[PDB]
Amino acid sequence: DCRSRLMEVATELFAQKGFYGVSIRELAQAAGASISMISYHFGGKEGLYAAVLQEQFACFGQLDDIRGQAGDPLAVMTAYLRWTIQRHRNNPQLLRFYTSELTNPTPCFAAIVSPAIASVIRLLAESIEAGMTRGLFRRDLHAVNSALALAGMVNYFFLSTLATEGLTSHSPDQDEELIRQYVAIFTRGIMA
Template sequence: MMIGSENIATSAEKILQAATELFAMNNFNAVSIKQIASASGCNSALISYYFGGKKNLYQEVLNAQAVVFFKLIDEIRQMDMPPLSKLRHYVDALSKIQETNPESIPLICRELLSPQPLFEKFVKNKLYILHQFMTELVTDAIACGELHTEIKPTHVAFTLESTIIFYFLTQNQIQELGNYAPGEEGVYLTQVLNTYLASLSK
């Protein structure tokens, strides 16, 4: 008996979603095929059938999360606004991604902080695109006179990325210690960004 295409898509999507949630909470080695099968409501054989095993499934999870950020980058590049406005829009959009897709940023942060040897190529080939985009915005801001000319764009990009990663890794603590209402802790990130950029602005 052949499985209908609708059922195939549904099963694959359930597996991918369950794997995404589990990998966001734990590293690659701490998540088992059995756990993914249980969380998705699908048997282990279907995971092998659709994805060829845990390694390929994790790669698919990372690729799916990367697409979210690449789409955002493409959208911002098309916007008609000054570079620093694009940068602020990018940071605001990251906060919204965290609200709607809470698994995305933890997965990306984990691969940046402690990449799995099996996925070093992913970090170099895809996550580096995020750094290149940030560096590009800073370079453009210098070129149009928004920032001082003596600063190094890649250094500024690394500082901004470190701030953003720290924010998302400690978001719950920031909300509690800063007495922010749920959803308002993004104010902290915006203020930090503006303070740092002000120190570099002409």
């Protein structure tokens, strides 16, 4: 059971202060574990951080709701948006770790974060590439940059929440309408 309480405490301290702001003394104190339990049995600060980040990014190795729509690029893009919104609703901590690693990487960035993000961007880009070949999508746009644009739309909506509280709804009630809006912008733009 002190394994579970350590995972909780590690997630909340590393989420707050990042890997570079947390000490093993703080982890032990917050969990009521000894520095020795932590170092010898739970992999130290580093082992706990790796375990926490692996849990944060676990869902990125499970892309079948998106991959399963291949053959219909619009359905792929829609599934990607729905999946991404779900991820954020289920895990309020994720953008803390995701942005902290992208802007102040640890050794876990190359091991866990970078391949997770790249796998998703690739998947989207492949679908865009297929749509371009088919003539559904315009051939003067670059598939990866286009994928990054879609990913940016949805991820910035959640990232900017605290600064935009009175400017738009962030209620989960409106998530399906957000998907409708971002699918429309990405595929058809804002032009009349």
